Amino acid sequence: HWGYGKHNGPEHWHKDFPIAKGERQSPVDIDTHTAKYDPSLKPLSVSYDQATSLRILNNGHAFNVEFDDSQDKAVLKGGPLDGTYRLIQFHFHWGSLDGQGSEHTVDKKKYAAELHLVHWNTKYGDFGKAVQQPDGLAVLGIFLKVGSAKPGLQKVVDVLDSIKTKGKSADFTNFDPRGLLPESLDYWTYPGSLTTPPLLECVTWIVLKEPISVSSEQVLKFRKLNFNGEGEPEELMVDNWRPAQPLKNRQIKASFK
Ligand SMILES: [Zn+2]
């Protein structure tokens, strides 16, 4: 099955998922000089005050912090969006070293990691129905650079020892994702896809300009996770990022001058 290696990594995904070579694939390089300021774009509304995390899961490619999405409690609206998108999970992509790990790039710069907060459009009723629609998901992407620790990440870091291998989960209640947000909500936006199989072209991407800082110790703990299951030959969970894909017939718009 698909993964991140030589024999099953991104360059192979098109065989099982031909949409990998589609017209609106993600991630992309964000050419900052090309991206046009769009005065019609609205401020992002991130309303996470009632977010209810439930659990954290090692799914064999990343770890997902999952939320209760049975009610309107953690929602993304405004920005480029029409209507209301509810938070289902967040996860990260990261590298083996600090010089790679992000999926989006900025003028070809790779960050150490990238956080994806995944939200589905309430007008389709559930996540599985939303991913079948071109406006089904809104993903908020946030870059990570290595420097000062992010205090609000440490609770995530300190549970990873308990979900080292694929298929392990742990109770993970009361985590506040507001602690992962940078100060500015300036963003770029474009139409794209999930960055993991099935690579469905259902996402409005909202990529924040301002990275968050995490410490080297925090990222090092991400890199102790395993792609393999318990007891299997150890292969560290690193370099779980898809590279930038062709922009094709898309415009990236900036919320900021
Ligand atoms: Zn992702």
Swiss-Prot record:
Resulting phenotype, residue 116 to E: Strongly reduced activity
Catalytic activity: hydrogencarbonate + H(+) = CO2 + H2O; urea = cyanamide + H2O
Site (described: Involved in the binding of some activators, including histamine and L-histidine): 89
Effect of residue 194 to A: Reduced CO(2) hydrase activity
Recorded consequence of changing residue 103 to A/Q: Strongly reduced CO(2) hydrase activity
Effect of residue 194 to F: Normal activity
Binding site for Zn(2+): 91, 93, 116
Result after altering residue 62 to S: 2-fold decrease in enzyme efficiency, as determined by kcat/KM ratio, and efficiently inhibited by chlorzolamide
Site positions (Fine-tunes the proton-transfer properties of H-64): 4, 59, 64
pH dependency: Optimum pH is 6-8.
GO CC field: apical part of cell; cytoplasm; cytosol; extracellular exosome; myelin sheath; plasma membrane
Stated consequence of mutating residue 2 to A: Impaired activity, not rescued by 4-methylimidazole (4-MI)
Activity modulation notes: Activated by X-ray, histamine, L-adrenaline, L- and D-phenylalanine, L- and D-histidine, L-His-OMe and beta-Ala-His (carnosine).
UniProt EC number: 4.2.1.1, 4.2.1.69
GO molecular function (one): cyanamide hydratase activity
Cofactor binding summary note: Zinc. Can also use cobalt(II) with lower efficiency, but not copper(II), nickel(II) and manganese(II).
Effect of residue 59 to H: Reduced proton transfer
UniProt enzyme class: lyase
Effect of residue 91 to Y: In OPTB3; partial loss of activity
Disease: Osteopetrosis, autosomal recessive 3: A rare genetic disease characterized by abnormally dense bone, due to defective resorption of immature bone. Osteopetrosis occurs in two forms: a severe autosomal recessive form occurring in utero, infancy, or childhood, and a benign autosomal dominant form occurring in adolescence or adulthood. Recessive osteopetrosis commonly manifests in early infancy with macrocephaly, feeding difficulties, evolving blindness and deafness, bone marrow failure, severe anemia, and hepatosplenomegaly.
Name the UniProt record assigns to this protein: Carbonic anhydrase 2
Gene: CA2
